[PDB]
Write a protein that binds this ligand. Sequence first.
Ligand SMILES: *[C@@H]1O[C@H](CO)[C@@H](O)[C@H](O)[C@H]1NC(C)=O
Ligand SMILES: *[C@@H]1O[C@H](CO)[C@@H](O)[C@H](O)[C@H]1NC(C)=O
Ligand SMILES: *[C@@H]1O[C@H](CO)[C@@H](O)[C@H](O)[C@H]1NC(C)=O
Ligand SMILES: *[C@@H]1O[C@H](CO)[C@@H](O)[C@H](O)[C@H]1NC(C)=O
Ligand SMILES: *[C@@H]1O[C@H](CO)[C@@H](O)[C@H](O)[C@H]1NC(C)=O
Ligand SMILES: *[C@@H]1O[C@H](CO)[C@@H](O)[C@H](O)[C@H]1NC(C)=O
Ligand SMILES: *[C@@H]1O[C@H](CO)[C@@H](O)[C@H](O)[C@H]1NC(C)=O
Ligand SMILES: *[C@@H]1O[C@H](CO)[C@@H](O)[C@H](O)[C@H]1NC(C)=O
Ligand SMILES: *[C@@H]1O[C@H](CO)[C@@H](O)[C@H](O)[C@H]1NC(C)=O
Ligand SMILES: *[C@@H]1O[C@H](CO)[C@@H](O)[C@H](O)[C@H]1NC(C)=O
Ligand SMILES: [Ca+2]
Ligand SMILES: [Ca+2]
Ligand SMILES: [Ca+2]
Lengths: 471, 482, 474, 451
Amino acid sequence: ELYVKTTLRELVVYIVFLVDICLLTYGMTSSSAYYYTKVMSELFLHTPSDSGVSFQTISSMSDFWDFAQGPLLDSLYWTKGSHSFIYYENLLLGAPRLRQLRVRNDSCVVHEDFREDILNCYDVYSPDKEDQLPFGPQNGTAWTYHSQNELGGSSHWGRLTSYSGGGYYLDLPGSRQASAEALQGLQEGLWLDRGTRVVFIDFSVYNANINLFCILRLVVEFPATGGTIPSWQIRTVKLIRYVNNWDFFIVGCEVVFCVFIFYYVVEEILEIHLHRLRYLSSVWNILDLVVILLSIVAVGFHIFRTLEVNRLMGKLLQQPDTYADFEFLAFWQTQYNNMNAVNLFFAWIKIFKYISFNKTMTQLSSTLARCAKDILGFAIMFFIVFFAYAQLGYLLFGTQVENFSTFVKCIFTQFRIILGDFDYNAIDNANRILGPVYFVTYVFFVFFVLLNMFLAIINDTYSEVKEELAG
Amino acid sequence: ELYVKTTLRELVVYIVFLVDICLLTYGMTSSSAYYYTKVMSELFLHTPSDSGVSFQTISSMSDFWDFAQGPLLDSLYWTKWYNNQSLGRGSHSFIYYENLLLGAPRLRQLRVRNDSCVVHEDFREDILNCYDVYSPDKEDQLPFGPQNGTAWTYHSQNELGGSSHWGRLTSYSGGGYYLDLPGSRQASAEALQGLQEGLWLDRGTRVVFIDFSVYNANINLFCILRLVVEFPATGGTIPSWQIRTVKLIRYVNNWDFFIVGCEVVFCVFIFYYVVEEILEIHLHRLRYLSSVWNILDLVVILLSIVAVGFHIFRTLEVNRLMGKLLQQPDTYADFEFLAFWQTQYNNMNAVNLFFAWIKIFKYISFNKTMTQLSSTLARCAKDILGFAIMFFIVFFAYAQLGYLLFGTQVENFSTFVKCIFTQFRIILGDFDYNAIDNANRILGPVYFVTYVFFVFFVLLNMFLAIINDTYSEVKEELAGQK
Amino acid sequence: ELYVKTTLRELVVYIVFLVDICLLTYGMTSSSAYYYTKVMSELFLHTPSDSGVSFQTISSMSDFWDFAQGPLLDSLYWTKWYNNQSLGRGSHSFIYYENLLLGAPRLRQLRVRNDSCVVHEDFREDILNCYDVYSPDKEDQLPFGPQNGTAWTYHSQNELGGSSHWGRLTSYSGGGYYLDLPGSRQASAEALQGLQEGLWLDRGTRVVFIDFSVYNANINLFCILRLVVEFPATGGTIPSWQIRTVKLIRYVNNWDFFIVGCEVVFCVFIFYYVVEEILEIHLHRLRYLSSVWNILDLVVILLSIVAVGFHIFRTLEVNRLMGKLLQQPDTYADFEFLAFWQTQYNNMNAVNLFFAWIKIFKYISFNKTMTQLSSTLARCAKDILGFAIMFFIVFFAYAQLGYLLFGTQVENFSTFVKCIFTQFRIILGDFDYNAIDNANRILGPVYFVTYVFFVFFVLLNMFLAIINDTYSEV
Amino acid sequence: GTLVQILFLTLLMTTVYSAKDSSRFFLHRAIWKRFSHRFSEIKTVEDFYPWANGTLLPNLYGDYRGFITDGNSFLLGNVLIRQTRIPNDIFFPGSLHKQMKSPPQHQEDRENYGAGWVPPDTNITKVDSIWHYQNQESLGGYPIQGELATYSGGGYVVRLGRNHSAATRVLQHLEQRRWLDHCTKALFVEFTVFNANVNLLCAVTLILESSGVGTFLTSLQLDSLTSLQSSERGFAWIVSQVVYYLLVCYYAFIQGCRLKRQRLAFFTRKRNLLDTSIVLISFSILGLSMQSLSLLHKKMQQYHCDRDRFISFYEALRVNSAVTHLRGFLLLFATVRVWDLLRHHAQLQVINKTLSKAWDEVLGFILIIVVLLSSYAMTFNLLFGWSISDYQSFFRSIVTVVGLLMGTSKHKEVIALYPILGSLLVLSSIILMGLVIINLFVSAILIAFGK
Ligand SMILES: *[C@@H]1O[C@H](CO)[C@@H](O)[C@H](O)[C@H]1NC(C)=O
Ligand SMILES: *[C@@H]1O[C@H](CO)[C@@H](O)[C@H](O)[C@H]1NC(C)=O
Ligand SMILES: *[C@@H]1O[C@H](CO)[C@@H](O)[C@H](O)[C@H]1NC(C)=O
Ligand SMILES: *[C@@H]1O[C@H](CO)[C@@H](O)[C@H](O)[C@H]1NC(C)=O
Ligand SMILES: *[C@@H]1O[C@H](CO)[C@@H](O)[C@H](O)[C@H]1NC(C)=O
Ligand SMILES: *[C@@H]1O[C@H](CO)[C@@H](O)[C@H](O)[C@H]1NC(C)=O
Ligand SMILES: *[C@@H]1O[C@H](CO)[C@@H](O)[C@H](O)[C@H]1NC(C)=O
Ligand SMILES: *[C@@H]1O[C@H](CO)[C@@H](O)[C@H](O)[C@H]1NC(C)=O
Ligand SMILES: *[C@@H]1O[C@H](CO)[C@@H](O)[C@H](O)[C@H]1NC(C)=O
Ligand SMILES: *[C@@H]1O[C@H](CO)[C@@H](O)[C@H](O)[C@H]1NC(C)=O
Ligand SMILES: [Ca+2]
Ligand SMILES: [Ca+2]
Ligand SMILES: [Ca+2]
């Protein structure tokens, strides 16, 4: 029935804590944060050049050089100061930076039949096999190697190799014809040659009306087989200023939240007086520690981010015309956002522990304990066949289809097939004799397993009531 | 309980055999194949001409000659960097600056005869000739055009060493009228001009193949391209393609000198399994065929010996092909046969691995995990069989109705098995109702609505009978216990 | 068990009938009938002119006269190979080099009178003309323009042997102002230029038809094309098309000389079944209409008799058409009537075959296979029959509400039937919520979420009443 | 008794159903296909002159004396271009640099100006100058609720009406003098058309809103109204309209007499609340439906008086939308009445055998659904709210989660973006729903076996 559980004090204080935690989490986001990533993602990607080369259309090296000297400069260095303002309001912080990662000349020895037609051979990228020598004119910074310690940077687990953070870089100058001449000098000399493996272009924009940084990087990968694979990453950062009244209200909510997590951690460590008895047996006494840990790491990252953004903006206003690394801050800010979302989810869940609802919910965890030992004998018997199917799909398709191109992608593709979201035509075109067979038999197996476990569940209670009525 | 039948020795030797077969089927599939096929495909059948004719956009005979001259030669022959500076390696076409071009591309065409028809009374004074649809009995084997070269004279399948091809309409033969494009781009752009000034594609044509192959040596992978254009009896084109990335040369690394030992272990393992399967036939004369696990063991052993034989076959074939290719260049090296059979061998290996993985269930056993449905069907077998045939009678009635109402407008209903799979997909909530509606806007909604209602009705009956039989039997045993 | 009902001798003579029907209706298809319509459609609808105006993207009268000259004469009159040398067949146009073009195309138009209204009493010194929506009462029958040719005078439906067309707005008539295009491409271009100069598509036009036909002799198939453009009274155009691939001449090769035996055994079977129905009527004088299978037998017999009569009709009509086509060329040979009725005959045959298939359950009867629901509804009919009626009564209200709120911006809610089918498709999980969200940002979400909660509530109540009925007292 | 009630209710549903004319749809679509051509390619403030010189002027004066495109729709009165600004306090950001910007909303700059935006010359307000904030009342306007705003009313106004030359002159004069600045907020282009083939008055408004980041969100809004006469239709509908309204007034008399023989204790009898709300709503519908036409006729007399001046029909369209909402309410009232009179004259239970309609069970179910929707909606809006559009806000996320429940919206982008978080959340949702339905099943089993 609808009745309040344990106490009327803890319920009220938890309601207060929930309102506070759901007000200090929605106060670090922006309503116009989705319209900023769409206006900046359609300006730099969907903008065709002459000959119609967007960013997502880049498919060779000549296409890369038509995109670089075309709609990349026309979008960075806008038209009608000493500083550039994209769309009359946005401010381009620092200076962009092209960065390239090469691969050594002799790393992938050729076969015996071809070693008179193909002299030297360039392997796929690997930090073991990487070129660290000057090339081209061997003159500037775009033709010599600078390690990851000089170029303060970090790995980029982007696609196929988790690329490093060093390489051959060039910081575009302030003007537009100056940077156009720089890129022309980089094209006439062969910057992109057989040894190139990846090229990053990263920069950052700041809007003033809304206080938002849009930090965007564009990666182009040149596989060992020629071609390109353009990908991108566009993120947003807040940089809350403490000048409004709402900002001081948010500071108040933050200090209240700190006091709340302290009171909850003391209330948790106090009831460990039941040293091991009934403590780590209850399930809620794991959710409490989880939300405590998450709420601690939250303020940890908050302090760190304040310090880092202060340092970065100081370095920027100290000496412009140099790359200001914002990628670290943006990446870890998105991690912080995800952690906050999960913490809010758990804090919303605990209300069920605090207040009881219809008898259905109170007996739901009693229903779950019915399939006590049937499920561990079902999980294995289902996952064995699930992974057999996953790798069968990876081996039949996976050269043609994209969703099957690797193992974990097969796992998630099958998990989506369960949810009624599939693309049967690509499967069929990949192999029109073992495609339909795979699809049909997989769906039949899933339905069979589901029906079987349902039969087991509702056959458990028959035997239960039978033995309890005749016992 | 997770008790294991089949005493632990058998279980551990099977675990070792399974890990060995897994090691030698994953250790010989490179992870850089998908992007190889992706870049080659989006280079060759996605590049527009000066008039906007990619390969997939081909829709007449006048678009073939627009693609076969503009973006087919601009893609095959690479000889300069992007900054107009000549490549180093000379007299060779390094596609994308990395992939070689083995041999010379080949164009092949198959024509159909002139008198394979009857216009039959009324058009016999307006329509003089009639060319049937393709079939090997009706096939032209006479020279046309100037009747001189190789592009104008028929060479049977055994002179070309060709093989069949399962296109989108029929399965085509291996002979035909062919032409090998020469080395340079200019010398091969004026060879495709004598084929146009003279009518190479006339009324009697039925299919044109363009075959070639590249070999990347950074990773060690061949990519064999075949581009097919079929001209139905109704006029038009149906462009299709097959791009196969394979690994035909095995040992160029240091990892492979270990899969050699893996192959040896696999061979001794299949020998042991067949010698132990002989004993269960000896002991049980005909009780051996009772269980079904022995059927699966026989299947796995047969697939294993087939996969052993194909290894020797491929070694011999690729040695011969590389010899002929490096011994007389400027000739078409037939890599398509080998690529086809290599992909078939890969598919067979995948199926065999799946069978071994699900065969793991005869060693480790659970008590009563997934017998909850088997135990409740054995009490309703003779009515399950009567339910299935009724459902299938009306299902195939609906499939025929769909194939006849639509099926000349909608593509999913174009054939019969396509109707079967389209309905099976409709069940899973994947349909295009607008196509059905526009095809026929009185019988379309009727078909859709009544089909959905019927399948809902039969799932309801299935669920009701299932949850009713168990209750019936449990209360029956409780009554009989009194 | 699977006991056979009422004999085992009748099941055999019915299985023979089933095999004969399958051979009759599957021997007259063609494996190459889909690609025919595919290639003709993508030739005539998808080909873009200069300025990039195909047929599917017509949106004005300038766009029409842009399509009717660029990519319509280029896609009709073929006289040279791709290498610019002449075809060896003179005075005829072989589309795609294989498909003969029968007769001559015909543009047709349906005008509307200049004073088919009374303008609003306030706008009378400003708007001097009202052209009402199309209906055969307010339809202009007077000459216009130069007033001399056949394109500027009204010919009734009887002078133009033709019939109605069920367009996407209404059903149009068969008269109008027509023009048969000549043979060569230059003469046709000059005729269309003369039609465009003296304004042919004025404010009073309501439809424009372009119909022609094509015969391919490699396969044996006609492809009758009709392209319709409708100019509503509110503005704009709604281009539509109907492309019908049919087999009118259907006895050519040796395989079709085999079906002329199945047709004979088919009419013999129809005679046998009608003489059996007369018998089993003579013994059950009025108890005959209590055996619903008998209604199905009567329906199948009726459909078979109609399908027998249409054969005679089509033979006579196609003979007449071929005669008129070879005696006087350069004139429109009306193949659209025959193509339409042939496709209707094919649809009727498909439905009759479906019925003859599900009529198997009249002999082969199973005991209680799919009876566990009818046995449930027969007992618990009240809270599951009346409840369903209540759900139906609560549905139509939602259909009307969706037609009220949206229905001027969204298309799926444009009419009542479209609202009904849009809701039925919402149930199956097929919907585009962004449209009704943009149409109304406050009542869109309300409509959607309350509809979803209602359907969930109804199906949950039904499932509960179904499962707690088996555990009632049995 | 009951015969007259069921007849009257069927007539009422006939009334609310028969107000259907599809000619109102196509009209909208037609206009929306002409003026919305190349409209989204406007991202700056100087990209509106080339868009209104080949996509607006040609479609507004389509080679006819008055009619918009291909005759049909007449162009009533005059076209208006309105603009709302913000005060030119960009003197503080001498270069639009990065500081504590955004003063308090920069409420609409309602002050006069001069030749350029030069300070004014006198202290009076002119009604004919492009550089004077006119009014909301003296303009006869209404707050155009855009996409992210309310746009409280008038502003700086220009008229470019009735020719093609008199519009090109105005556009050139506005382009030279730099009328559209960087200080401009939303810009509206408004006009109205009357189609006489199907008697239908439409009002069109093209909206350009200035987002925070320098750009422009472009939208198009149309409102229709059928200006037919009292009858001008079939006698059946007229006879079905008069008989329904006399039945309505008879029922009004009946309930009035029932409420005089029962003075105040009539709240409990909910069988009369519906029957009196129905009569009130029907009378309101009729009254407003004729008042809208009276207002339209008044405005048309005003038009005939002093032609060639901008005329706004916002009042009539507002009354018409009120009538539409009244019909939408009357429909659900009628269905509730029909359903609660078919529960007593033929007792058909619905929730029975599991009713539990006390104040505890229903409230508890509502609460658990609300909590389980709010939790998932909030976390989905926080995780994928920056990239995906369906989870852009909170309520949008609630509707998207309900769609996920129904299957309408398929979650494949939440699996592409976050393959391990979104997958885990979907798995949790599936497990929860499965547990719920299994618990219902086992409870229904155990209640009817344990005795
Ligand atoms: C091969 O690599 C060496 C460095 O190990 C370099 O000196 C040489 O120029 C390279 N050759 C080519 C052709 O790039
Ligand atoms: C490049 O070399 C020139 C001399 O050739 C030298 O003056 C210059 O400092 C070097 N570095 C540059 C230009 O970055
Ligand atoms: C490319 O270089 C060749 C070398 O002779 C020259 O003839 C040609 O004009 C160049 N093409 C350009 C620069 O576009
Ligand atoms: C018909 O086929 C014969 C067989 O070779 C050939 O000689 C003749 O030229 C063909 N006729 C035409 C018109 O192509
Ligand atoms: C054409 O045929 C003649 C003999 O008929 C032969 O000598 C010649 O080599 C052939 N090829 C030509 C002329 O290109
Ligand atoms: C094709 O032939 C005609 C007729 O001789 C000629 O006028 C034209 O220039 C040729 N070439 C074309 C159309 O490209
Ligand atoms: C309508 O068209 C007719 C056709 O000639 C013309 O005589 C008449 O003047 C036009 N206007 C009216 C108001 O009838
Ligand atoms: C109209 O037709 C008449 C036929 O009597 C002809 O004399 C006249 O020249 C034609 N005029 C035009 C403009 O076609
Ligand atoms: C407006 O467009 C017309 C034709 O589209 C053109 O002649 C005129 O020059 C344009 N006006 C301006 C100011 O560009
Ligand atoms: C232009 O419009 C004005 C009023 O708006 C009118 O007085 C004048 O006659 C019109 N001129 C032309 C050429 O239409
Ligand atoms: Ca606790
Ligand atoms: Ca065995
Ligand atoms: Ca009978």
